Symmetry: C3
């Protein structure tokens, strides 16, 4: 009896509309199940593992994709910190997690899954340490290495060897500052574009979280990291996200969110001559109603502020507004 | 602890033969796991969720399909009724459930998965209410809306916007009557047939269930709803199913089942000139042996009464008899 | 009441290098979850089921395969023995299990998944009995039948009707002897090679397992059973495997493993004229470090002793060394 196992998951009945121009109306129901395991090895040492499995319930029974989102195991040793390996969130995502607190959208621009260390990815060894080796209360950090994923994927989702690091200072009153950087080799396949051999990003964030108020802001820049809808990589991006939300005691939680991603020095193709354009720009207005920890409902509206222009037409980016409603059983 | 979670599932070791003509002999082993969640939100209101996951164990490792059969969440508010949304059984299936109580086959004709609301489908908002708002004991009903699924599927599995409704009256002595109707728009892709722009069905059923006897009968008609093996839709269908079973005290439960589906005004193709033909016609003779709630074994034989004729050859329908044995662990 | 359910599984963070010639460096993280169900039917009789599900966490979220490795249900009646059906280990694998105790590799030569009854396969009815009907302590056996899998697979993974049997005698001091045989029809598709209509193997093994020492040895021969990397079948093979390991009190457990598979009378193709060649030949040197039952780490190195020669070039067999490290949470 030195072990703890914890099933968690959710059934999410959800539906999304596109309300302007290229209108559409789609089911996006899914279920998620995960497991969290923690074993007491010593008085000084803990071993742990996590997996998280997503199940599309949205396509017909022949064709529903499943995804293993997380899968890792690690040791954890008091103030010496922790170390895990497997499929995990990239460390620079710690910066973003403040502003990825939206109802339906959020972390669209700049953070993609299987995109170096901007979101969830394969083959990450991660070292963490909260309270800076016991020396500084509230200062945590993350160092992380990623091996190359170079052959059995689209060029869009490849990476060379690389690393990523994030620090977060959290003050007693409710503020937390947070900053992170990542540098990676690009894959031999990626380098054929002539855009450069390295891929980098840095990110900064602040959040306030006290008295039922939640506000967060986040700024970053990426270089040869962020993929466009075209499958070309943005040579330079400037990303800004921001969120404010309030929590009523009775379950209601309205939310206002802003998300922008400016591409700089973008390559020419088709109708798009130049090299400066918004990739993502939208406001999310939405709300949750929490009945209790186990049950909630939500709704949200995305005001998509991208224009129909030379870039959006050539790169095939959607300029239209969207809406989403959903109901969630949780455990 | 105002929450309840309930794992259910089964391992099903099963094997099926085709015994006439085009003989064959195939494994059809699978496992199924599901989860049922119910939270007490207050005295008046309950929240719930269900997910059900099927795992083919029948193909080689590398080619086994998984299916999320059910995934939904809903609220439930006493005699005001319940409301769920996600991937669920279509409401007109309530009519059929009486006669889909066979050993191996059953609900072949007329009910297909991802076929408007005849079986399990995507994007269904369903309202239910048992005992007709507290006014009529034993009278339950279901109203249900389905949004369009019109792009990322075969034409066979598409649907337009539509609705479906079922009522069931159940008497104290053991009889239950049941009736239901559905009307749907067809998809732009489906309408290329020239068959018509709407898809409809109605269904009626009765069952008797007392003194170790189980009998059920069911009649329906569908219009532009029921897919043929050819991927053409039957313009008009007349379906009749019937079942009788008896439960011996010692665990044995023999079953006799009849299932027929007549196509009317069928389009011509290949060898098939005319437009009148049986799509399904078979007798199932089979039995279960229940060891206890958790374990049973079963066997069944399908006498396939379709002839080798112009229709069956052109549409590629199987005319051959089948047999099936299986063992089930259940929880 | 008279039912028992048992979740087991593991998260495995793991990474593999190819260190010679065609170098590579790949993540091979996965999670596994399984369930073991046992119901008491009466004093004399037990019903059971098992399912085991593997989840690749190694590819990108679009493309991760899952596998149902085991899925069966059976009855068990004291000394009368047990009987299960579904997807299970083939009975002749009982012989191999002694020598498939390596860190990363092991049971490469001769045992393939979905290869008659050499590993995990579909449609196996298996009868088992330990202690030979209560008469001989430590003598167990397995008889097993497999139906044909003949149409919706690669020729490599097909089988005709067949059977397989294994016996194991285990002495109280720590030795166990073990022997087994299998005969199968080949599929109509397999027989096109002209190699013969039947597929057979026999296998013998011994193991010692006491006083922190583990040694095992294993010899077999197969005929028209074992697939080459070319998708031709080896008309005759001679397989030898051997393993020694020691368990230190501190958690460390080094392992030395040897695995060879000689092909005899191999068909000519490409550069390869003759008909005698090694298919598999390697030494594994590796170690575990067990923190406790729930958590371990390991590393291993595969010295691949196959030469670059006429066979390896024509059949496309990899001659290169490999290495592997990993961490495991287990329950």
């Amino acid at each position: 009896n030195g072990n703890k196992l914890d099933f968690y998951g959710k059934m999410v009945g959800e539906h999304v509309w596109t309300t302007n121009g290229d209108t559409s109306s789609d089911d996006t129901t899914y279920a998620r199940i995960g497991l969290k395991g923690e074993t007491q090895i010593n008085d000084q040492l803990i071993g742990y593992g996590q997996w998280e499995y997503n199940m599309d319930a949205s396509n017909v029974e022949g064709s529903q994709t499943t995804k293993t989102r997380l899968a890792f195991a690690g040791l954890k040793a008091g103030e010496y910190g922790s170390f895990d390996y497997g499929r995990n969130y990239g460390a620079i995502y710690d910066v973003e997690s403040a502003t990825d607190m939206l109802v339906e959208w959020g972390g669209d621009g700049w953070n993609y899954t299987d995109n170096f260390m901007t979101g969830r990815t394969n083959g990450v060894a991660t070292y963490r340490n909260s309270d800076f080796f016991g020396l500084v209360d509230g200062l945590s950090f993350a160092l992380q290495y990623q091996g190359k994923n170079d052959h059995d994927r689209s060029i869009r989702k490849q990476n060379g060897d690389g690393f990523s690091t994030a620090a977060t200072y959290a003050f007693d009153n409710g503020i937390a500052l947070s900053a992170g950087y990542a540098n990676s080799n690009r894959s031999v396949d990626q380098k054929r574009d002539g855009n450069g051999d390295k891929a980098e990003a840095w990110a900064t964030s602040a959040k306030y979280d006290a008295n039922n108020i939640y506000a967060a802001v986040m700024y970053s820049q990426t270089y040869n990291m962020t993929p466009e809808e075209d499958d070309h990589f943005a040579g330079k991006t400037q990303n800004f996200e921001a969120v404010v939300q309030y929590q009523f005691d009775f379950g209601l939680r309205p939310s206002l969110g802003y998300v922008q991603t400016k591409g700089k020095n973008l390559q020419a193709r088709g109708g798009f001559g130049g090299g400066d354009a918004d990739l993502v720009k939208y406001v999310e207005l939405g709300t949750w109603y929490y009945f209790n920890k186990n049950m909630n409902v939500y709704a949200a509206y995305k005001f998509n502020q991208l224009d129909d222009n030379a870039y959006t037409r050539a790169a095939g980016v959607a300029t239209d507004d969207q809406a989403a409603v959903g109901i969630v059983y949780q455990f």
